[PDB]
Design a protein around this ligand. Structure first.
Ligand code: HEM
Ligand code: K3Z
Ligand code: CL
Length: 393
């Protein structure tokens, strides 16, 4: 009773324009079977939300990529947070929640906002820039490694490592093979910086190690928790901020509404996360036979959740293909939902808000003025190059 589809959601053709295929995935049924990779798929909001919020049935400890850790060796030691179920997940989650807490945002906000304002003013002196390399990448590179407390040496490995991280959740296609092959130098750099002596006191990494005193994590758990932030904390925000600028460039009416009320910056970024869904997909693995939308899925099956499709499902969203900075976005699954919901969401929103605030106060127009190039990744959606001309307000 389950429709079988041949759509490859990790193919370059799909990445290049996923929306027609996502509708076919939604409209085929609440649950589909993807013959290309032998996994189940859910693409509607209701089922994606249900799977995310049913962690005892749809577990994370067998991996959140295609690979089943019960069957294949993980490419690196399993994540203590992303690839753990409760109760093992709980205390590492609590540490990260405290390290990336509301109280912590107060300590970094002035620096993050200052860097965003300075970057936009710098770009306005150049006129014609690449909104990826010069903005979406440059700005997070200017604040997040420092907030982590990383040394200067080796930071050139951060974006390559993240590309590997997010390609590795995918199937064994060319993107994944090429990423994992000869990835040892990227892994070695990151694993070295996770050690306590290499992390600046006061930064996120040192604060993680400081929590080993409390009994919430052991000293040998702290480097892997630092690793989780170096895996997820940079490339996500690159594609989130790039998504927002791409939206503002394509919807000039919405840039003008943002200009008229810069306090819409935070929601304008949140809507960009829904609209583009920089993190497109994650998997779960069934721990038991389970009925889901009329489908009876066996134990030990991989289930692919299309977060971006859920965020564009007209069953849930009015006018889902419209970028609307005053939309009530609560309930979107671009940061996940439930026990694994993005623990770094305050850092992501802070970066996005202060950058969009700077644009709102300083920029009158954003015009695409060069060839746009898409960046292909098994998990991340975003652009490789976005040439724009910025007109000062
Ligand atoms: C626009 C930016 C971001 C997006 C769209 C995003 C997306 C997501 C999603 C969808 C999940 C859920 C994973 C799952 O359910 O399996 C997640 C979890 C996570 N994210 Fe974020 N993320 C972003 C930024 C960040 C930042 C800035 C950090 C760290 C500074 C971070 C660190 C993490 C970690 C450690 C987890 C694992 C949480 C857990 O398993 O409990 N992410 N993210
Ligand atoms: C939202 O994407 C991600 C990606 C990776 C991770 C953790 C990685 C690790 O523990 O090494 C967490 C979230
Ligand atoms: Cl690693």
């Amino acid at each position: 009773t389950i429709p079988h589809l041949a759509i490859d959601p990790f193919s370059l053709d799909f990445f290049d324009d996923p929306y027609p295929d996502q509708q076919t995935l939604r409209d085929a049924g609440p649950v589909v079977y993807l013959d290309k990779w032998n996994v189940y798929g859910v693409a509607r909001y209701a089922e994606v939300h249900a799977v995310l919020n049913d962690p005892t049935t749809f577990c994370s400890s067998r991996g959140v990529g295609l690979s089943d850790f019960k069957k294949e060796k993980p490419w690196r030691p399993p994540s203590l947070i992303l690839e753990a179920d409760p109760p093992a997940h709980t205390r590492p989650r609590a540490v990260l929640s405290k390290v990336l807490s509301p109280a912590t945002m107060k300590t970094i906000r002035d620096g993050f906002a200052a860097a965003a304002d300075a970057k936009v003013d710098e770009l306005l002196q150049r006129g014609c820039i690449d909104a990826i390399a010069d903005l979406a990448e440059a700005y997070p590179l200017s604040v997040f490694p420092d907030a982590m407390g990383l040394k200067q040496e080796g930071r050139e490995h951060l974006l390559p490592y993240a590309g590997l991280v997010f390609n590795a959740f995918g199937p064994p296609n060319e993107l994944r093979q090429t990423a994992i092959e000869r990835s040892a130098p990227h892994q070695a750099y990151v694993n070295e910086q996770c050690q306590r002596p290499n992390l600046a006191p006061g930064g996120f990494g040192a604060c993680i190690h400081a929590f080993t005193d409390t009994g919430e994590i052991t000293p040998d758990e702290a480097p892997l928790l630092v690793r989780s932030l170096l895996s997820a904390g940079l490339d996500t925000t690159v594609n989130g901020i790039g998504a927002a600028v791409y939206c503002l460039a394509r919807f000039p009416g919405e840039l003008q509404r943002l200009r008229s009320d810069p306090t819409l910056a935070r929601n304008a970024f949140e809507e960009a996360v829904r609209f583009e869904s920089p993190v497109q997909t994650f998997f779960r693995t069934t721990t038991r036979e389970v009925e889901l939308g009329g489908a009876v899925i066996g134990e030990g099956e991989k289930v692919l959740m299309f977060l971006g499709s859920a965020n564009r499902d007209p069953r849930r969203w009015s006018d889902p293909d419209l970028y609307d900075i005053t939309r009530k976005t609560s309930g979107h699954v671009g940061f996940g939902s439930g026990v694994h919901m993005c623990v770094g969401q305050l850092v992501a929103r802070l970066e996005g808000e202060v950058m969009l605030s700077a644009l709102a106060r300083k920029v009158a127009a954003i015009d695409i003025d060069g060839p746009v190039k898409r960046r292909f990744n098994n998990t991340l959606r975003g652009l490789e190059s976005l040439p724009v001309k910025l007109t000062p307000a």
